[PDB]
Design a protein around this nucleic acid. Structure first.
Ligand code: ZN
Length: 503
RNA sequence: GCGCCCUUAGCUCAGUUGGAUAGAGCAACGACCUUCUAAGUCGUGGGCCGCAGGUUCGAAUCCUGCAGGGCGCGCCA
């Protein structure tokens, strides 16, 4: 209990584009960003008026997942945001997302923000007192040893729980900068108190917290044992003015949000948490700092570019630094990196390994990459014809209810408003392409997992062994292999999958 | 994220915060001692400068820049 990987069958629940929190479905005269790329933009310009563009969501209702398994998941792209563990395919949807990582050892921050760190260190010091005037090329030295020998601004680590003290600034700040004058209490309990991470992992032992607050003088090499969300309050005198919210994985730290007190924002609390929590890595033995979820379609997130982020890729699990591809990722275009064996007529082969399913790939710094995703799932790419016939063989090979769709049926018609078109699109770079699934059955690798997994329906509550693969209903079998196309091959081996019918 | 502030001894301070780093308390020596030159009072002597350049006989000193020293509060899923 509370230790196995739990993920339900994804169901693309869709809503009108007005409900979108970032894009609203309107981006002026920038219809190229709305669709995949320019190739279909030149052809769907007159067809977009007859086909509605909604806000597609790809995700599932998860219960709990162990920290070790989720580390791949947050590296894959399925970053936690509430209990709806979700992701957005890079092809169709109007608001794409994918995890990013930052490295504090060699971050290439811009010179514009270099003046910001010069401001917070002067005021905090107690005037005459100075820790000697020496060279400070590494900015760690003047912050770690200054927060403890004074009472200017001291912090304290806390778990992710409920605290009444934060409520005062949690409401007024939204009423002040977010214009959210109607804040029910459920907006705090749901967001930062019910996480998919294991409750024992969040609790752990206080010893991990004890050494965590001792990060200032702890010697590197000590074994860390912290895994889960983190809350680092920002005390001042005898109150709080900022609340840090982030999640520390067993391999890195992922940040989400920030909160200020409206009028008590004297000490420029916004940039303090960011600049004094990526320096945790140097003092500890951690390796990664995840900024969270990146959105190119939302211009507001451009400040995260200065954080040294890392635009991810979900089709091939190959990290690539944000700055070298700053222009390439612009305008909301697709981003799938090819290989030396690039082909414009055959689909991509996939790899299912313990370390080769989103557990880091070897990367070279000085490399002039090129974009090949445009020639795969677009007008100029011939891979669509091969994908069109790929679905035909799936139906006549084993008997799984996957039927192809016509040429002008890639997106739901505006006449489909009266009947919700529940289903999983086949042309999705995030989803496993049909090329690899075809080789799975031929190679016999599907057989090993066959006969070991149990059929588990939420509305049935029945346990029965699997002896004949074709005896189970095909519609249920359809949902089983859908997750195999989305959530790592092997993976599902150490996991149990549930299904949703028409939720 | 943008703003105006000051970048001189181990310290506080001068040179309208541009033309020698000087007094004073400290630690040093000493004609200064009833064994108060290791708790009097007087000569004072080592303690000399920050990272780069910038436009001028000139730079502790109009500072664009950087690391470190001052002040409203921000386009912060
Ligand atoms: Zn959207």
């Amino acid at each position: 209990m509370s230790d196995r990987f739990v993920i339900w069958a994804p169901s693309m629940h869709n809503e009108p584009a007005a409900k979108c929190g970032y894009c609203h479905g309107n981006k002026g005269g920038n219809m190229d960003q709305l669709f995949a790329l320019d190739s279909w933009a030149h052809r769907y310009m007159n067809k977009m008026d007859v086909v509605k563009i909604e806000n597609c969501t790809i995700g599932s209702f998860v219960e709990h997942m162990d920290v070790a398994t989720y580390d791949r998941m947050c590296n894959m792209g399925f970053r936690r945001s509430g209990k709806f563990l979700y992701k957005v395919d890079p092809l169709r949807n109007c608001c794409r997302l994918y995890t990013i990582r930052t490295a504090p050892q060699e971050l290439n921050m811009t010179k514009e923000l270099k003046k910001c760190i010069s401001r917070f260190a002067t005021r905090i010091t107690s005037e005459d007192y100075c820790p000697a005037a020496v060279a400070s090329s590494d900015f760690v030295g003047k912050i770690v040893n200054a927060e403890m020998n004074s009472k200017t601004f001291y912090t304290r680590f806390e778990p992710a729980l409920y605290s009444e003290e934060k409520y005062h600034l949690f409401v007024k700040y939204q009423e002040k900068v977010h214009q959210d004058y109607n804040n029910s209490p459920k907006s705090f309990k749901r967001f930062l108190c019910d996480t998919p991470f294991g409750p024992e992992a969040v609790l752990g032992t206080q010893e991990s917290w004890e050494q965590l607050n001792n990060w200032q003088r702890m010697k590197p090499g000590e074994k860390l044992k912290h895994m889960g969300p983190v809350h680092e309050c920002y005390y001042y005198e005898g109150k709080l003015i900022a609340i840090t919210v982030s999640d520390i994985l067993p391999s890195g730290i992922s940040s989400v949000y920030f909160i200020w007190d409206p009028d008590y924002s004297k000490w420029s609390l916004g940039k303090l948490s960011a600049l004094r929590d990526l320096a945790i890595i140097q003092r500890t033995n951690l390796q990664y700092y995840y900024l969270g979820y990146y959105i190119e379609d939302c211009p507001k997130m451009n400040y995260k570019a200065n954080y040294g982020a890392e635009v991810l890729d979900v089709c091939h699990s190959k990290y690539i630094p944000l700055k070298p591809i700053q222009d390439m990722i612009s305008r909301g275009k697709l981003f799938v990196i090819g290989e030396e064996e690039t082909k414009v007529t055959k689909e991509l082969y996939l790899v299912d390994s313990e370390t080769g399913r989103g557990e880091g790939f070897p990367t070279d710094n000085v490399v002039k990459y090129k974009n090949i995703a445009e020639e795969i799932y677009g007008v100029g790419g011939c891979a669509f014809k091969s994908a069109n016939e790929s679905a035909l063989e799936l139906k006549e090979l084993y008997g799984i209810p996957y039927e192809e769709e016509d040429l002008d049926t890639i997106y739901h018609l505006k006449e489909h408003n009266g009947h919700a078109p529940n289903g999983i699109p086949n042309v999705v770079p995030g989803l496993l392409p049909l090329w690899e699934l075809l080789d799975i059955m031929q190679s016999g690798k599907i057989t090993d997992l066959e006969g070991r997994l149990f059929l588990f329906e939420i509305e049935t509550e029945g346990i029965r062994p699997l002896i004949n693969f074709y005896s189970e209903p095909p519609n249920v079998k359809k949902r089983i292999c859908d997750v195999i196309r989305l959530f790592g091959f092997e993976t599902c081996m150490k996991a149990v999958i549930l299904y949703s019918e028409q939720m």
